[model samples]
Target: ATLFIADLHLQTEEPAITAGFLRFLQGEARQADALYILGDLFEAWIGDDDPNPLHQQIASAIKAVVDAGVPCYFIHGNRDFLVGQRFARQSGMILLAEEERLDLYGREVLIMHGDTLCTDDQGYLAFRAKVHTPWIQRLFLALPLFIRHRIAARMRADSKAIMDVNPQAVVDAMERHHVQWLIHGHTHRPAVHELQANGQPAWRVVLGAWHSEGSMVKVTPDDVELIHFPFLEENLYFQSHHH
Candidate 1:
């Protein structure tokens, strides 16, 4: 089986999902042949120089998964695009471009963090284009987390826009990528969509951010389904750290 997750927004306001996710990696992911973290796995990653212990622990968890033999891949989320090579290497997950394509059992698939598909957020689209440069990111990263946090905090406003992916653009992207199967995360809406692409059937699989609302895409030769889990106990965090 192949597992896909996104919008984890880990180490955000609360990390109930932090321990929750660790529990999953040590157990559920062990059974999957591959894992795809669709994006925003971290809330606001300034760079790989992060000092938060939970972020580091999450990085270590990603490494442990690789050690166990699963090939994990990631796309940058709107929030965590600052993730650089060091964090990618440390996480032991392969980095795909912000947008990517793949072959799953001969089913051509497109994967993304989903921010690029938002047409309604004209300002964000413009803002993103301006900031996507490494030169800007380098200068931005040099600032203390104080300002970064403030910026990140205010941007939460943009996260509430529910224009929820322009359908016209979605089909356009799928065709451009030569795939009818699209998997992306951003809307925090977990769903499977059946759309038309050039008079044929098309599929759009959306992944949600983690929490009591946690969800993932389980892809197998016979199936591609989104699975949701029950609330995880906070104690699991203590168990992993002390043990």
Candidate 2:
């Protein structure tokens, strides 16, 4: 099965999901033929050089899974767009472009972290374009690792503050990005979108957040479904049985 996950927001205030994800690395993720981390896998990733105990632990877990045989794919979302080649190599995952296409189940599917679709989120789109520039990223990475960490911390705090004050813009931004078919989770909105695309029937599978709930997309030859559930101790049991 091909699985998609996003909005993990790891390294944030949510410790349970982070621990659960680590357990996932040791448990089920290692057994998959392929895994797609849609985006926001971290709350903030300033640079590859900014290493910490948490980063080391998570990176090691990912590397172990890749070493086992599964081909893991990592895509940068709004939060972790700073995730560079250095981290991708460390995690033993292939870093893909913003919007990528893949062949699955006899159909050509588009794979994305789902941020580029948010045209209505004008401020975020502008910021994304700015930070994603090669020159800007190079400059940021050139700074000392500690400097980058400081910047990341401040940015994370500012983002939280801004999110608290702007409800209308937030909702409108999502609505503007609401295409008929899209698989994204930045808004923590999880649901399947079935509608028309280019005059043809289309389907967009959305992934949910791993914080409040454990979310996943299982794509197999006969099935493509969005699955979600509250974190439960028994969830580990189900994950084990699947792999």
Candidate 3:
């Protein structure tokens, strides 16, 4: 089985969410053949140079999962687009482009962070293009760590103020890629959407954000399921009491 998750928005401030993710990494994720984090795994990632203990702990947990033999992949999100090679190395996950096509159990699947499809948000589109530019990113990364953190906080706040996605664009992209299933997260809206792609019946699966609880999409050759679970009390206890 393969597992997909996104929009975790993980931060030290949200201990429950972080504990929940750690529980996942140590438990459910270990049994999967592959794990894909579509985007926004972190609340904000200023740079690889960040020395926060939370960052290190998250990376270590992910690394432990990978070391246990499950292949993991990551995609850039609106908030953590700055995640780079150093962090990827620390976490032991492969970094994928914004959009990718892959074969899954005899079916073609299209995967992404889901923000680019939000064409309805013109302001966001313009800002995305600007920040994604190579020169712009280079300049931003060159800033002092404190400055970068402040800027990241401002961007996250501004993003939450305006967010929307375009369904038609998502369908068009799926058709162009000839994929029967599209899986992504960003809208924080979780549902299995039935739609047509290239005149063929297809499914679009949206992942829910981990705010008050945790959610994921479990995929097998025979079926796909959207599942949610609360943060386990034992896991939370272990996290808080563990050395």
How many clashes in each structure? 0, 0, 0
lDDT tens readout by residue for model 3, 1-243: 999999999988899999999999999999998999999998888889999798899999999999999999999998789899999999999999999997879888899999998998887789889989999999989999999878888877886772666878978889889888999999999999998888889999999999888899998999989999876654433346564
Q: Model 3: residues >4 Å from true position, as ranges?
A: 156-162, 233-243
lDDT of 1 by residue, 96-143 (tens): 898788888778889998988899889788878877987898888898
Put the candidates in lDDT order, highest first: 3, 1, 2
Worst 10 residues of 2 by lDDT: 162-171
What's the TM for model 2? 0.83
> In model 1, which regions exceed 4 Å deviation?
144-161, 231-243
Clashing pairs in 3: none
Candidate 2: where is the Cα deviation over 4 Å? Answer: 162-182, 230-232, 235-243
Candidate RMSDs in order: 6.1, 6.5, 5.3
TM-score for each candidate, following the candidate numbering: 0.88, 0.83, 0.92
Better of 1 and 2 by lDDT: 1
Clashes of 1: 0
Question: In model 2, how large is the Cα lDDT of residue 41?
Answer: 88
Candidate 2: deviation at residue 155, Å?
A: 2.3
